[PDB]
């Protein structure tokens, strides 16, 4: 009745979802799929209600008829006086990151280097950087630009998956879910941190959250911001503090999507759920916190302050915006569920 089946992608999200289900008196239950695309299908069938998505998947879901419901909102230095749930979303910065020690590596000498992507089809890890590379290159052969990569979601046998490591046992190599060691923002950044790749396509927040003691993980423990450099499009290299002037693009925030006939219901349930387990929530941190998962960004990014209303009741094209939407169309002409 006032119920939403959340779609978890992978066993680790399934685990976090089950805790949330317990804690919500089952006002929220869970469905699990191996990929984000399969989750989108369960929602289309009506077997799951919603899940939080990167802009790149919002475009996929968007063509299949799903709509953005609420968006992730993180800390701000403006729009401070108004509440988080009513505050407009600012978007994040897609950046290219390298080690300072890898001197002379610039945006112009990326050909034949090793890359770390969050996953195929994602905004900062794939659509933006590959879109730029296909445009600058006049060729749709992005499968040959980098010598080796870890781009979760690609053909496990291709060079685009050579750098991926799989799980603690070597299985699930290159799967586009957290079982794959170098998946998502954290994984792609770990891929560069462990010097597996030369460059990581992540967002600007990732660098800051996994350096200078912010993360207590074993591989991030000793990482220092000064040991990293951002690659700008003009050919320069800048400190990570200069992201506002050295990013590849500003990306629309990840957002919760659902089938439109369920949008209203999913919205109400979620606003109540964050009042309980949110940042200033009734039951967080003592019983449960929806937006924490020890740096793993399970279900939601860990730096989320709240899920905000959209208002202007935007379709997915308006949400993603005309600039971003045309970018994806361009890149995809290089190659239901395939919905339009
Ligand atoms: C890769 O190159 C393509 C082709 O140039 C880029 O797409 C182009 O993007 C611009 C800006 O988004 C579009 O211009 C816009 O045109 C509309 C009217 O058509 C106008 O109202 C806007 O003010 C703006 O001038 C252009 O239409 C679009 N071209 C195509 C064929 O889609 C694309 O953005 C590049 N990809 C990346 C990631 O940079
Ligand atoms: C690049 O991404 C990082 C990570 O999100 C951004 O740095 C963060 O900046 C915010 C403010 O914009 C800081 O939030 C504030 O922290 C202070 C405590 O130091 C507190 O007064 C506020 O209540 C709020 O929590 C945040 O601390 C900081 N993150 C870290 C770990 O330094 C940065 O703004 C992004 N830059 C670009 C170009 O987007
Ligand atoms: N508020 C987001 C808007 O969506 C459209 O806006 C982004 C740009 O977002 C700006 O947001 C403000 C705060 O709202 C920040 O201060 C700026 O730094 C950001 O650039 C567009 O690029 C994109 O087209 C997007 O669709 C929105 C308004 C109302 C309802 C839903 C979304
Ligand atoms: C379950 O949903 C009902 C209906 O809104 C609400 O009153 C109750 O607080 C919810 N229980 C929990 C623990 O979320
Ligand atoms: Fe993203
Ligand atoms: Zn810009
Ligand atoms: Zn509209």
Q: Do domains 2-73+255-316 and 74-254+317-327 have the same CATH topology?
A: yes
d(CA 84, CA 165): 38
Distance 318 CA to ligand 7 centre (A): 6
Ligand positioned closest to the Cα atom of 265: 4
Sign of CA dihedral 46, 52, 57, 59: positive
Report whether residue 2 contacts ligand 4, using a CB cutoff of 6 Å.
yes
Domain boundaries, the chain: 2-73+255-316, 74-254+317-327
In angstroms, rounded to a whole number, what is the distance separating the alpha carbons of residues 211 and 246? 19
Rounded to an integer, what distance in angstroms lies between the CA atom of residue 308 and that of residue 258?
Answer: 15
CA of 36 to the centre of ligand 7 (A): 26
Distance CA 43, CA 102 (A): 44
Instruction: State the first-to-last Cα distance of the chain, in angstroms, to the nearest integer.
Output: 32
CATH superfamily of 2-73+255-316: Periplasmic binding protein-like II (3.40.190.10)
281, 280, 254, 333: which is closest to 51 by C-alpha?
254
Asked if residue 142 lies in contact with residue 334, where contact means CB atoms within 8 angstroms, the answer is yes
Distances (CA, A) of 170 to 15, 103, 126, 181, 259: 21, 32, 24, 10, 36
Which of 69, 72, 30 is closest to 47 using CA atoms?
Answer: 30
What is the CB < 6 Å shell around ligand 2?
75, 77, 93, 204-205, 208, 214, 243-244, 303
φ, ψ at 268 (rounded to 5°)? -60, -45
Q: Is 165 annotated as a binding residue?
A: no
Give nearest CA residue, ligand 4 atom 1: 27
d(CA 24, CA 30): 12
Token pair, residue 289, equals 């916190």
> Resolution in angstroms, to 1 decimal, for this deposition?
2.3
What residue ranges in 282-332 does DSSP mark as E strands? 306-309
Contact 335, 69 (CB under 8 A): no
Dist CA 202 CA 249 (whole Å): 11
What is the architecture, at CATH level 2, of domain 74-254+317-327?
3-Layer(aba) Sandwich (3.40)
CA distances to 17, 65, 97, 256, 315 from 259, in Å? 20, 7, 36, 11, 12
Residue 273: how many CB atoms within 10 A of its CB? 20
For the chain, helix, strand, coil in percent to 5 are 30, 20, 50
59 is in an annotated binding site: no
Q: Which of 325, 330, 334 to mutate to test the pocket of ligand 1 (most atoms within 8 A of CB)?
A: 330
Rounded-to-integer distance, Cα 235 and Cα 110, Å:
11
CA separation for the pair 243, 240 (Å, rounded): 6
- Cα 299 to middle of ligand 7, angstroms: 27
Residues facing 96 on adjacent strands? 201
DSSP annotation string for 184-241:
HHHHHHHHHHTTS-SEEEEEHHHHHHTSTTS--STTTTT--GGGEEEEPTTS-EE-GG
Across 140-178, b (16+ Cβ under 10 Å) vs e yields eebbebbebbbbbbbeeeebbbbbbbbeeeeebbbbbbb
Which atom of ligand 4 is closest in space to residue 25's alpha carbon? 13
Q: Technique behind this structure?
A: X-ray
**Cα–Cα distance between 310 and 302 in angstroms, integer?**
20
Q: Which residues surround ligand 7, an ion (CB under 5 A)?
A: 318
Residue 224: name the closest of 245, 244, 242, 210 by CA.
Answer: 210
Measured in Å, residue 323 CA sits from the centre of ligand 1 at 7
Question: Is the separation of the CB atoms in 125 and 202 below 8 Å?
Answer: yes
DSSP 61: H
Classified as helix, coil or strand, 244 is helix
- Cβ(33)–Cβ(7) below 8 Å: yes
* Ligand 2: centre distance to CA 202 (Å): 16
């Amino acid at each position: 009745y006032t119920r939403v089946v959340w779609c978890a992608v992978g066993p680790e999200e399934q685990k976090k979802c089950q805790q949330w289900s317990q804690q919500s008196g089952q006002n929220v239950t869970c469905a699990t799929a191996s990929t984000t695309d399969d989750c989108i299908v369960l929602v289309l069938k009506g077997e799951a209600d919603a899940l939080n998505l990167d802009g790149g998947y919002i475009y996929t879901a968007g063509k299949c008829g799903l709509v953005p419901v609420l968006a992730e909102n993180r800390k701000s230095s403006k729009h401070s006086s108004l509440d988080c749930v009513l505050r407009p979303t600012e978007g994040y910065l897609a950046v290219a990151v390298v080690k300072k020690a890898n001197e002379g590596l610039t945006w112009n000498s990326l050909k034949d280097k090793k890359s770390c992507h969050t996953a195929v089809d994602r905004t900062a890890g794939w659509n933006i950087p590959m879109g730029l590379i296909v445009n600058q290159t006049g060729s749709c052969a992005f499968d040959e630009f980098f010598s080796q990569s870890c781009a979760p979601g690609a053909d496990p046998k291709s060079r685009l998956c050579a750098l991926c490591a799989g799980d603690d046992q070597g299985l699930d190599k290159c799967v586009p879910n957290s079982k794959e060691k170098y998946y998502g923002y954290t994984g792609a950044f770990r891929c560069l941190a462990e010097d597996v790749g030369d460059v990581a396509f992540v967002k600007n927040d990732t660098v800051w959250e996994n350096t200078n003691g912010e993360s207590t993980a074993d591989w991030a423990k000793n990482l220092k911001r000064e040991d990293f450099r951002l690659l700008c499009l003009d050919g320069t290299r800048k400190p990570v503090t200069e992201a506002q002037s050295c990013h590849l693009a500003v990306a629309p925030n990840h957002a919760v999507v659902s089938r439109s006939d369920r949008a209203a219901h999913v919205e109400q349930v979620l606003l109540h759920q964050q009042a309980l387990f949110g940042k200033n929530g009734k039951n967080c941190p003592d019983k449960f916190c929806l937006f924490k998962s020890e740096t793993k960004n399970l279900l939601f990014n860990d730096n989320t302050e709240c899920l905000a209303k959209l208002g202007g009741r935007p379709t997915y094209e308006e949400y993603l915006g005309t600039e971003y939407v045309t970018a994806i169309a361009n890149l995809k002409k290089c190659s239901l569920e395939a919905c339009a």
